[PDB]
């Protein structure tokens, strides 16, 4: 889709497989912020968003936290935090036609910079001058959108680039999206390194009498230390106790 109206696909309740990101040859930029690109298969995310669009090549630098430009200001803005990855690849062969490919549009004019992850699909006439527009196109009244006009013989700079932005949400809360990781069996009365659906720690997993309400997934005691957890496969409440330590 055009950058001004970018496609957003929500991803949840799946076994995340990022093999496509590593096996593909087309990708030109594979930037990641807040996560490491190679470690994406060892993480559990609460929810994922895949925002896909087509941009000009020279503007691919604008898809990043804390950047400025026409695309960042008026088309697609990334938040300053942005734990996630931007993947962009040249698509000159697929998104360019002899003559001109004018399907793809961007937003030239807007009253103010759009907030992070905000989409503006309105096509109202922009009032650049003092005179009100009243829906007509005139001297200072302009159509907000503008065609990229992609042609095969263009500088790598002005060639189309397809961009996909993945927005991970990383938190101790129960994560729906996870890597395969081949879950294993669990033992009770041994100090173990446990990975419970993203929760990770070192301790013994005793059987627990905690009464968990169905929506509850783990327990935190005073001072907010995780002391109980329910395993996804069995749905039983286990107390996490740190294995004994002490000065000698």
């Amino acid at each position: 889709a055009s950058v001004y109206a970018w496609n957003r696909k929500r991803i949840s309740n799946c076994v995340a497989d990022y093999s496509v990101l590593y096996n593909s040859a087309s990708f030109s930029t594979f930037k990641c912020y807040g996560v490491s690109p190679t470690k994406l298969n060892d993480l559990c995310f609460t929810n994922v968003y895949a925002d896909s669009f087509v941009i000009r090549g020279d503007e691919v630098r604008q898809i990043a936290p804390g950047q400025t430009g026409k695309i960042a200001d008026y088309n697609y803005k990334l938040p300053d935090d942005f734990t996630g990855c931007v993947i962009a690849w040249n698509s000159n062969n697929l998104d360019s036609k002899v003559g001109g490919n004018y399907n793809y549009l961007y937003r030239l004019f807007r009253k103010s910079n759009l907030k992070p992850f905000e989409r503006d699909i309105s096509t109202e006439i922009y009032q650049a001058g003092s005179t009100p527009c009243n829906g007509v196109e005139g001297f200072n009244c302009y159509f907000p959108l503008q065609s990229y006009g992609f042609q095969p013989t263009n500088g790598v700079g002005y060639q189309p680039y397809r961009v996909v932005v993945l927005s991970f949400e990383l938190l101790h809360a129960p994560a729906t999206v996870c890597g395969p990781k081949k879950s294993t069996n669990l033992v009770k009365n041994k100090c173990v390194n446990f990975n419970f659906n993203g929760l990770t720690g070192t301790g013994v997993l005793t059987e627990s009498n905690k009464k968990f309400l169905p929506f509850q997934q783990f327990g935190r005691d005073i001072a907010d230390t995780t002391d109980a957890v329910r395993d996804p496969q069995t749905l039983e409440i286990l107390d996490i106790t740190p294995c004994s330590f002490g000065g000698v």
Partner: antibody
């Protein structure tokens, strides 16, 4: 890298054809051997490959029943056996050596099998 | 994998660009590299490896031949067309076990 083949074998329908590919210029024990079929003035169809060191042969689904691949490392030669010939089988067969991550990389001339009574 | 080869009959005069295109049903890229190969066959001769991989050039291949593209779309370009380029050009995939070739393009010099 040179591959040498038989020359223009003719057989009646229902018979079997035994096809040879002598290999020279390399070890022949480190590269798998592929076979490709080409009907006259038509496209190329991959038949199957054989590993010379261990006789693990993998064939195309179309050619699985009527084709058998074997290899002799002592004389550094490969063989394809075509069984139950039909008029469709009349074509040029090529023996190729693996290379550059291509299956049929280095081709050896080409031998024409003509099926007719 | 099914490879469809656009123009399969191309007539270009000497010294002019010649483009033969291959499109794949599924992705051909794997392990980071691409596995689309271009073969050339002069009449009465075995096919010869022209472009192994997406862009790497085969042994004894002039700089005229160039391979480009990725994913499912690849192109073979011959800008300095010569007399010797009259041949049948195939596109082949090496990603999956059944190796499949393109439709084939008979390249002719225009007059």
């Amino acid at each position: 890298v040179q591959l040498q083949q038989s020359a223009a074998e003719l057989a009646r329908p229902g018979a079997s054809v035994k096809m040879s590919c002598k290999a020279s210029g390399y070890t022949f024990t480190s590269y798998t051997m592929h076979w490709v079929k080409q009907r006259p003035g038509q496209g190329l169809e991959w038949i199957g490959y054989i590993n010379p060191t261990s006789g693990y042969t993998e064939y195309n689904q179309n050619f699985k029943d009527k084709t058998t691949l074997t290899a002799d490392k002592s004389s550094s030669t490969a063989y394809m056996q075509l069984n139950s010939l039909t008029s469709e089988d009349s074509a040029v067969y090529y023996c190729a050596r693996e290379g550059h991550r291509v299956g049929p990389a280095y081709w050896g001339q080409g031998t024409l099998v003509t099926v007719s009574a | 994998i099914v490879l469809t080869q656009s123009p399969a009959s191309l007539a270009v005069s000497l010294g002019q660009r010649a483009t033969i295109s291959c499109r794949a049903s599924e992705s051909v890229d794997n392990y980071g590299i691409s596995f689309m190969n271009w073969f050339q066959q002069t009449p009465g001769q075995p096919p010869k490896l022209l472009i192994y991989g997406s862009s790497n050039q085969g042994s004894g291949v002039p700089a005229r031949f160039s391979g480009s593209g990725s994913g499912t779309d690849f192109s073979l370009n011959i800008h300095p067309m010569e007399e010797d380029d009259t041949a049948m050009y195939f596109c082949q995939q090496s990603k999956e076990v059944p190796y499949t070739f393109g439709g084939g393009t008979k390249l002719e010099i225009k007059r």
